[PDB]
Structures are given as structure tokens and as C-alpha cells.
Design a protein around this nucleic acid. Structure first.
Ligand SMILES: [Mg+2]
Ligand SMILES: [Mg+2]
Ligand SMILES: [Mg+2]
Ligand SMILES: [Mg+2]
Ligand SMILES: [Mg+2]
Ligand SMILES: [Mg+2]
Ligand SMILES: [Mg+2]
Ligand SMILES: [Mg+2]
Ligand SMILES: [Mg+2]
Ligand SMILES: [Mg+2]
Ligand SMILES: [Mg+2]
Ligand SMILES: [Mg+2]
Ligand SMILES: [Mg+2]
Ligand SMILES: [Mg+2]
Ligand SMILES: [Mg+2]
Ligand SMILES: [Mg+2]
Ligand SMILES: [Mg+2]
Ligand SMILES: [Mg+2]
Ligand SMILES: [Mg+2]
Ligand SMILES: [Mg+2]
Ligand SMILES: [Mg+2]
Ligand SMILES: [Mg+2]
Ligand SMILES: [Mg+2]
Ligand SMILES: [Mg+2]
Ligand SMILES: [Mg+2]
Ligand SMILES: [Mg+2]
Ligand SMILES: [Mg+2]
Ligand SMILES: [Mg+2]
Ligand SMILES: [Mg+2]
Ligand SMILES: [Mg+2]
Ligand SMILES: [Mg+2]
Ligand SMILES: [Mg+2]
Ligand SMILES: [Mg+2]
Lengths: 117, 144, 64, 201
RNA sequence: UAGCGGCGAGCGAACGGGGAGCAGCCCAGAGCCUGAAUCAGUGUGUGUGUUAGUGGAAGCGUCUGGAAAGGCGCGCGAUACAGGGUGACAGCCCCGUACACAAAAAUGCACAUGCUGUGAGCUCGAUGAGUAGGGCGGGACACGUGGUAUCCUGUCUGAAUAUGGGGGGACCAUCCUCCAAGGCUAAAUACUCCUGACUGACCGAUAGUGAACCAGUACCGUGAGGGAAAGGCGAAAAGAACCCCGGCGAGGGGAGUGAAAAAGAACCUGAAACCGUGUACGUACAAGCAGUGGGAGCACGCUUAGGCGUGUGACUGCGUACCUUUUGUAUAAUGGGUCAGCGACUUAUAUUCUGUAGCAAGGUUAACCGAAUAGGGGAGCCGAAGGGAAACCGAGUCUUAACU
């Protein structure tokens, strides 16, 4: 029962090199190198599904801050104000409104100010 | 029931280990041998009883006894054996014929093991105190 | 082929009814005058092989 | 229990422990796997590094050349080298406990009955060693893929059956586990039953 | 196992039991009867094997296709459906196969018979001496000089004679058993350079022989010796007439053959590394494992819009490869130029445990027989009894005079 490995091995290498498309040089041509590239790609990707949630929140905050300061209050007090007003709109939505409905954002600032006054 | 609808009892054909076939298997690389040293090597390992150099237990301790050539031609008979002989007479020959003692046995003892529920005539055999009580209770006879 | 008995083990251990091994005590061969009578008395009777050593003895006596 | 004769419209009295017991599949499996293994010839070999042709000369000095150290031109690492765990003729047969053998047969016969694959008749023979006659008889009986088991060897029947691929003929003494399974129907003469019964105590 | 054993590592019987096979003779001598059984060499006969061979059943229509053995229809042979070949997969086209047959000649083996030679049965004898034994040194016996019987003998010695002698594991007695120092003998047993037939959960061109091929070659070496690489057009060569560029080239473009030249001789399939031509997108103010997360723009498809697929990726957050070895490696420690193929926990027998199955105080047979994976074979082995060094006692036993 002698077993030849070509068909199985070829499918295995091809499955990796296909995931390496777009990579530079040996990384998209040469199995040994492609394999290490695909692994590192998964590692980073795992890492960055966690990081992605960090970077976006960091973006929202920064924009809320800008829009808050435009209406004369700082991010930190604005958040405290809204918390004391039992407003529960989160930061993704608040950052959207900061950009697309400047009049509603101002109204949110007045609700924050009132709750702090 | 066809040659392609028969299968073995659950758990009766466990699969063999195959070392050295990668990370997923759990037995890759070192193959469960750990790292380095004598035991990791092909053909590596120490002999039975070896303890590292210390005088081992089977040399530490002293020899005792001798072997009795007589014990080996001496057999014990159970009460449960007495009915298994054709003729209700138990001798060395009878017991040999019924395959109860070895062909070269020259002495035998009936002991209190199992039971006897039929009258038997034991003869040319030693009989234990208990066995004599049991053999006689069932109507049997002992004689030299 | 058949496993071979470590024959020197077979001259020092005997299997008992429940599967352990009996053996003779060390220290009662010579240099006896200095040894207390009490001490020597307690070395006369046979003793049982300890838990730590059964693996070793059993390995040496596959046909015990 | 009683087996209805196909066309005698008569009954035959058989041992319930033989023809009437539960299917022990694990038991049957072990015996048919053992039978198939017992049919293996086991004849082959390959060459170890010791048996490959060539000499024991070290292909190059141990140190200094920059090549991986080598020792034998027949190393199994090497093209043209020995096979690391080269094969030898082996005997693949297995022991089957006598009682496990008979038990397996009993279970088989009992499923055949239970699956209506067992057919009993008074006689089964042909008038001449002509394949055409057997074929004809089989058509008339609505049989095609079938094991015929008779009491004593029947020569005509044996010869007439040989070129029929879906048909095998067998005297009661020579039955086997995989034949009892491998055909759609099994036809047995009364005598064959009486003999198999005696055989399975 | 009993034993041997720096009683270490190891070495390892025999008695007895089950089987295969079975076969018993001659000389050490003269007489009487005498060619009387036997063997061999060998003529002849028949028998029968081998070395060439002979016969050997039964299918046609239709569809697809370059081709039919394939599909579909309806037939037929089969003691032959083992296998192979034929333009794709054939019981019925071919070769075979089942079965039935055959030798002028040489040869094997067998009974029969002639022959040269060998001697049969009978009576009365005879009965293996530098031998057995022994001292010394070694060797062989499972047995290593041990308390060491038995065997062989290099050296020195040296008996008895059936009223005798050997052995029974130091040695002695008793008893039992056998008869050395002369020889022959078939079967059961071991093997395969070779011949024929058949088979394989053996390989299928880096495998299987070193060798599928003009291989023990080419090649290396003074020599012994070492020792490769290297299979596939197509069904059929129908292997490309003829024309054109070119050196009466290499190479190519047509034509033609073919089902196909997406088979053209470097010829089935035709992967990967590696190298090109073409298009889309990016790229010449920009610093690092080259990706990943966010993301404009362009190109290309959508959906008929919907802020979606695909490719690209300005800009931006994070981010020092893998293996190995280590307390610890981006490590300036190891290993890998890349790809493809190969490359490492097996196998046999013992042993124990787990899982599973059978039978259960029983379970199971081995060699072998065989009606051959059945059935026979229970010789054995493990288990239902232990304790004691042992004798021995025994559900107990040992310890001790005896155990609270
Ligand atoms: Mg690519
Ligand atoms: Mg990382
Ligand atoms: Mg295994
Ligand atoms: Mg290592
Ligand atoms: Mg270490
Ligand atoms: Mg270790
Ligand atoms: Mg027995
Ligand atoms: Mg002492
Ligand atoms: Mg090879
Ligand atoms: Mg059997
Ligand atoms: Mg041996
Ligand atoms: Mg014998
Ligand atoms: Mg015989
Ligand atoms: Mg023909
Ligand atoms: Mg074709
Ligand atoms: Mg003599
Ligand atoms: Mg002698
Ligand atoms: Mg001594
Ligand atoms: Mg003689
Ligand atoms: Mg041959
Ligand atoms: Mg080759
Ligand atoms: Mg190939
Ligand atoms: Mg040309
Ligand atoms: Mg054409
Ligand atoms: Mg062309
Ligand atoms: Mg090609
Ligand atoms: Mg620029
Ligand atoms: Mg740079
Ligand atoms: Mg260090
Ligand atoms: Mg680090
Ligand atoms: Mg490095
Ligand atoms: Mg390097
Ligand atoms: Mg590779």
C-alpha cells in the first residue's frame, strides 16, 4: 500500500498561496514564505478586530470634543452632562450627529449644560 | 445484513497513535518523548531493574530458599474434582485419566475446596481434616 | 521471543496471594556480634516489597 | 421453531438457538473480518538499507567538505536507498474462538430467516451438468442471486453452477460466514438443514 | 522452568507428554546345503510422466462517435464469464479458457523380465586393547571446577574378558538397566543457480532489481573495486507530397494527414519554482518583517440608482520572519537560495493493562490430522488455594516451647 503525496500536497500549498495574493515578492510566489506571511496576516487580523473597536471609539470622541467645544463645552463635561440628564445616546451616534445634524448636536449640548447647571 | 452494513462494537477498534505528524495531532515533533536525554533516543532507555547505579533492589537484598523437587510431583485435589472421575473411585490413576492432576504427579492431597455431593472412595491419597469430614458426610470412604 | 526472567530477582522475591512480593531482610548475613538481639530478631521474618519498588520487581519477574 | 418449505407446503423443525436467535452484529463482524483476512496471501517485501545493492563505503569524509554528513549510499533518506521499515511476508490470519465462530454462523442464519432470505426445499438438483438447466430452474423459482446449500456434494449441480457468477453451490459441511451473507437468497435442502443443525449443536 | 552465572550482564536444558515419519542389517568364520532373499550396473516389455502438438461452443439490429466492446432492443453458448488483444469497457470478432486428445525420437520413474557380479537359510562357533580406566593441560556438555557425574584428547600411563564390563550427575552398597573400543541403512528435515504452471489488500519509472531502455554498460580507479542517467506521438506513420523566408542551414509560415497537430518526433497529461509580452491601478519629498485595521481616488461589473462585487491602494493606527535551542532570541545564536518528488516511532514474538466480543468455575487449544478459514486434535497453558526455605499442613498456614 504505497501512498504518493502529490495531489494532497499540491492542494495544500495552493490553498496557502491563494491566501497570499497581493503580497510582495516571494510572499505571493514561494510557499515557505507565503505560509509565514499568511499566518502573520491572521495574527494581525485577530489583534486588529479588537483594535478596530478602540480606534473607532477614539475617533468618535475626538469629533464629539470638537463639536462640543464649538458649542462652548468640553467633551468631558458634555459626557457628564448627558449622563446626569439620563441621555443614553452612544458615541458612534453622537459623532454622526456632530457631523450631519449640527442643530441637533447643539440641542444635546443644551441638555448637557442644563443638567450641570 | 450485507458485507457493507456490518460494523464493529463501539470502542472495539481504537485507532493507533501516530507520532510525528504535526501540531494538530498533539504528538508532533518530539512524539511524546520530551526533550533530549537517553530516553528520547532511538533505542534509548535503561534495562529492567536499573536504578541509576545504586545497588539495585534485587542485589541489595539477599537470596533465600531452595527448590523442592518433591513439590513438583505433588498436587492438590479439590472436592469439586471427586465427581469428575469415571467410577466413583479416586486414585492417582483415576485423577490422571480425568485430567485433574499431571501425568508425572506421584502424590496428591484432597483439600476442602468446592464440594462433594456423591459418595466417593478415595484411595492412596492424603486427605485434609476438613475434606475427610466433607467426603464422609456425603457417604464417601477414605483408605490408604 | 519470550521475555527472560531476571534470574537473580527470582532468587529474592516470591509472589503472595494478593499479588505483592515477599522478601528477606538485608543486614543479617554477617557483622552480627555488634548488632542488638532485638534488631536481629526483627530482621528474621520476611517482609513485603514497598509501593515504590513493585514496578521494579514486577519488571524483573514477568512470569511470577 | 418451524421453517415453511417453499413448494412442499410442509414444515421442518429446527433449533431456535440456531435459527431463532438475536443478531449479534459485533460477533458476526469479527468473524467475517477474520475470514477475509484469512484469505490474504501476504507475499511481498521491500529492501532495507541492508539489502539494497551497493557498498559500505562512506560517501564522503565526515568533516570539511560542507556537505551534510553521510554514511551509507543506501540511507533511507536517499534516493535509491533502503526502505526505512521495509516489508516482509506476513501471515494475516487471525484466531477465531471456535465458539465465536459457531455463534457467528448462528446469528447469520437467524437474520437470513428473519429477513426472509432463507429458503428451504426437499431436494435441489439438476438432471445433467448443464449450466442452462440450472439457469432455467432458477428462473422458474424466481431466483437469481443465490447460494445453494445441499446435504452432500452434487456434481452436476456444482458444474452447472460454475459459470453463473451470481450463483454458488456448497455442501452443508463447507458453508462459510461470508457466503451466507454475500448472496440475496440462500436455498437449503432439508438434509442440509438437518446437517447444519447437527453442526451448530 | 531446573540450573549456569564478576549468581552481574546474560546463558538456558532434560525427564515426561502430543505429533511427522518409521526399517532394519552386515563383518570380526568355518561347515552344510549351495547361485536360494537383497542391491547395483544393464538389455527387453508393458505402464506412465517430460521434451513438439490437435480439436475446442455461442450476435445481430439501432444510437452516439473518427472508431463501439458503450447506451437501447431482441437473441444465443456456458463442465468454457481465468486472462489477454482488437480504433472507448467484448461470454458469443481474435488468441484462449472448461473439456477431450496426441509422439517418429530421446529421457525420468515405476511393476515385469534376461544378464555379468553380489550372496540366501541352516548348524556349531567367534564377540572390536594401547582400548576402558587414571595423572597433567585444554576443549565439549544449558552446567564458567564447582561437591561435578558424562563426552573428546595434546601429553604420560593402562585393565577386566559374561563367574566380565558401562551407566543410573561427587562417592559407596543394594537393585534396575545396557553391552563401548567394526561397519551400513530409506522416510519424516534443510535449500533454490535453474525449468514449467499458477497466485498476490506487493511496486508502477526519484518506486520496483544497480539495470522496464544494448547496465554491471557509460564513467572513475594502477588495482581489488566502485558504478549512473535514461520509459509513453498516434488507433494506424496516415512520421507532414507541394509552395514560401533562410546559408541546397538552424528555425519558421502555409498546405495536407489525422477525431485531434489545444498529438510534429525535445511529441499523452503538462503542476511549481523561474523568465517574458499586454492591459488596469499605484509609484520619483520618501525611511524599517512589507502585512493588518481604517481609507480616498481610479478602473471594471452591479443593481437599473441606493453611499454594493472585483482589481488597485494615496493617506493613516498598530506591527522586529519561521524553525531550533534556551532562564531568556528581532536577535549580530542554529538551520533553510527557491520549487517539485522522496525523507523518520515500524515489524515479529513474548508480557501486562484498557476498550470490545465469546464462553464462564471454567476458558482455550499447539504441533498435527483434514472432509482444509469447517471439523478433528485438550499434549499443554491460565484460573477456581494458600501458607511455609522445605518436609508438610491446608481455609488456613507460618512464626515460637506456646502466643495474650
Ligand atoms: Mg501566482
Ligand atoms: Mg504579533
Ligand atoms: Mg501499531
Ligand atoms: Mg530536539
Ligand atoms: Mg535538558
Ligand atoms: Mg527526558
Ligand atoms: Mg492435561
Ligand atoms: Mg547466615
Ligand atoms: Mg529502491
Ligand atoms: Mg480448529
Ligand atoms: Mg535457544
Ligand atoms: Mg515423544
Ligand atoms: Mg504413525
Ligand atoms: Mg474458440
Ligand atoms: Mg478513446
Ligand atoms: Mg563388544
Ligand atoms: Mg567411557
Ligand atoms: Mg561449597
Ligand atoms: Mg557399533
Ligand atoms: Mg521459477
Ligand atoms: Mg530505477
Ligand atoms: Mg511520470
Ligand atoms: Mg525543416
Ligand atoms: Mg480534417
Ligand atoms: Mg498548423
Ligand atoms: Mg505535451
Ligand atoms: Mg509625490
Ligand atoms: Mg527604504
Ligand atoms: Mg545561553
Ligand atoms: Mg522579543
Ligand atoms: Mg539568524
Ligand atoms: Mg545558512
Ligand atoms: Mg518540498
Amino acid at each position: 500500500a504505497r501512498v504518493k503525496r502529490g495531489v494532497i500536497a499540491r492542494a495544500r500549498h495552493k490553498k496557502i498561496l491563494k491566501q497570499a495574493k497581493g503580497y510582495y515578492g516571494a510572499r505571493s510566489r514561494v510557499y515557505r514564505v507565503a505560509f509565514q506571511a499568511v499566518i502573520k496576516a491572521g495574527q494581525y487580523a485577530y489583534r486588529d478586530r479588537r483594535q478596530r473597536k478602540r480606534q473607532f471609539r477614539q475617533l468618535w470622541i475626538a469629533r464629539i470634543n470638537a463639536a462640543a467645544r464649538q458649542n462652548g463645552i468640553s467633551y468631558s463635561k458634555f459626557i457628564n452632562g448627558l449622563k446626569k440628564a439620563s441621555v443614553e445616546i452612544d458615541r458612534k451616534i453622537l459623532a454622526d450627529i456632530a457631523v450631519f445634524d449640527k442643530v441637533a448636536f447643539t440641542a444635546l449640548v443644551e441638555k448637557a449644560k442644563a443638567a450641570l447647571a | 445484513m450485507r458485507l457493507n452494513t456490518l460494523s464493529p462494537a463501539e470502542g472495539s477498534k481504537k485507532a493507533g497513535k501516530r507520532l510525528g505528524r504535526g501540531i494538530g495531532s498533539g504528538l508532533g515533533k518530539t512524539g511524546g518523548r520530551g526533550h533530549k536525554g537517553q530516553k528520547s533516543r532511538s533505542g534509548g532507555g535503561v534495562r529492567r531493574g536499573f536504578e541509576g547505579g545504586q545497588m539495585p533492589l534485587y542485589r541489595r537484598l539477599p537470596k533465600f530458599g531452595f527448590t523442592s523437587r518433591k513439590a513438583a510431583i505433588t498436587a492438590e485435589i479439590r472436592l469439586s474434582d471427586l465427581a469428575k472421575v469415571e467410577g466413583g473411585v479416586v486414585d492417582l490413576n483415576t485423577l490422571k485419566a480425568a485430567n485433574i492432576i499431571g501425568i508425572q504427579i506421584e502424590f496428591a492431597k484432597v483439600i476442602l475446596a468446592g464440594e462433594v455431593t456423591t459418595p466417593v472412595t478415595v484411595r492412596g491419597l492424603r486427605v485434609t481434616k476438613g475434606a475427610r469430614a466433607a467426603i464422609e458426610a456425603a457417604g464417601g470412604k477414605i483408605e490408604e | 521471543p519470550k521475555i527472560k526472567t531476571v534470574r537473580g530477582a527470582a532468587k529474592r522475591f516470591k509472589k503472595t496471594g494478593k499479588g505483592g512480593f515477599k522478601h528477606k531482610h538485608a543486614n543479617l548475613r554477617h557483622i552480627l556480634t555488634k548488632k542488638a538481639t532485638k534488631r536481629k530478631r526483627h530482621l528474621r521474618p520476611k517482609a513485603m516489597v514497598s509501593k515504590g519498588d513493585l514496578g521494579l520487581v514486577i519488571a524483573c519477574l514477568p512470569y511470577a | 421453531m418451524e421453517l415453511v418449505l417453499k413448494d412442499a407446503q410442509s414444515a421442518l423443525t429446527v433449533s431456535e438457538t440456531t435459527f431463532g436467535r438475536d443478531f449479534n452484529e459485533a460477533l458476526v463482524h469479527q468473524v467475517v473480518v477474520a475470514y477475509a483476512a484469512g484469505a490474504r496471501q501476504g507475499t511481498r517485501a521491500q529492501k532495507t538499507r541492508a539489502e539494497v545493492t551497493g557498498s559500505g563505503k562512506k560517501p564522503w569524509r565526515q568533516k570539511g567538505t560542507g556537505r551534510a554528513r553521510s554514511g551509507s549510499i543506501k540511507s533511507p533518506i536517499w534516493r535509491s536507498g533502503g526502505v526505512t521499515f521495509a516489508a516482509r511476508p506476513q501471515d494475516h490470519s487471525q484466531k477465531v474462538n471456535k465458539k465465536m465462530y459457531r455463534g457467528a454462523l448462528k446469528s447469520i442464519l437467524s437474520e437470513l430467516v428473519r429477513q426472509d432470505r432463507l429458503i428451504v426445499v426437499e431436494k435441489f438438483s439438476v438432471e445433467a451438468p448443464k449450466t442452462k438447466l440450472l439457469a432455467q430452474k432458477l428462473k422458474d423459482m424466481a431466483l437469481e442471486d443465490v447460494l445453494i446449500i445441499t446435504g452432500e456434494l452434487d456434481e452436476n449441480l456444482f458444474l452447472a453452477a460454475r459459470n453463473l457468477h451470481k450463483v454458488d453451490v456448497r455442501d452443508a459441511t463447507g458453508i462459510d460466514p461470508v457466503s451466507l451473507i454475500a448472496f440475496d437468497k440462500v436455498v437449503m435442502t432439508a438434509d442440509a438443514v438437518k446437517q447444519v443443525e447437527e453442526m451448530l449443536a
